[PDB]
Write a protein that binds this ligand. Sequence first.
Ligand SMILES: [Cl-]
Length: 131
Amino acid sequence: SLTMKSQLQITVISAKLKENKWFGPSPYVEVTVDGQSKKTEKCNNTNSPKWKQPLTVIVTPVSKLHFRVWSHQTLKSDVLLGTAALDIYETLKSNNMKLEEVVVTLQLGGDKEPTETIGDLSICLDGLQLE
Ligand SMILES: [Cl-]
């Protein structure tokens, strides 16, 4: 029951990234959960990326979703801009135990400094219920 899986759709909607003082980042989002990793495509040179991109992951009612916002680079590692996490069980609680097009915004915490908010990330969850 807490072990039954669902192929959850997560639409990664958009993010607002605090400006860094010339050209902006070229961000995409990676979702990781339960052995899996799914990445959106990138937006180029923007602190207000709008992906509106649906991804799926196979989760249980107690899975914990982890988000990373990366900036793409050709010639070295992509840069980790910030991270967030969302407990699917808490999300279910907040929405009568059924995730039907639930929009959630999360604060993104900095890589080098976890305590610093570097932006926020909006997603929409659909296709999971408990009971
Ligand atoms: Cl949470």
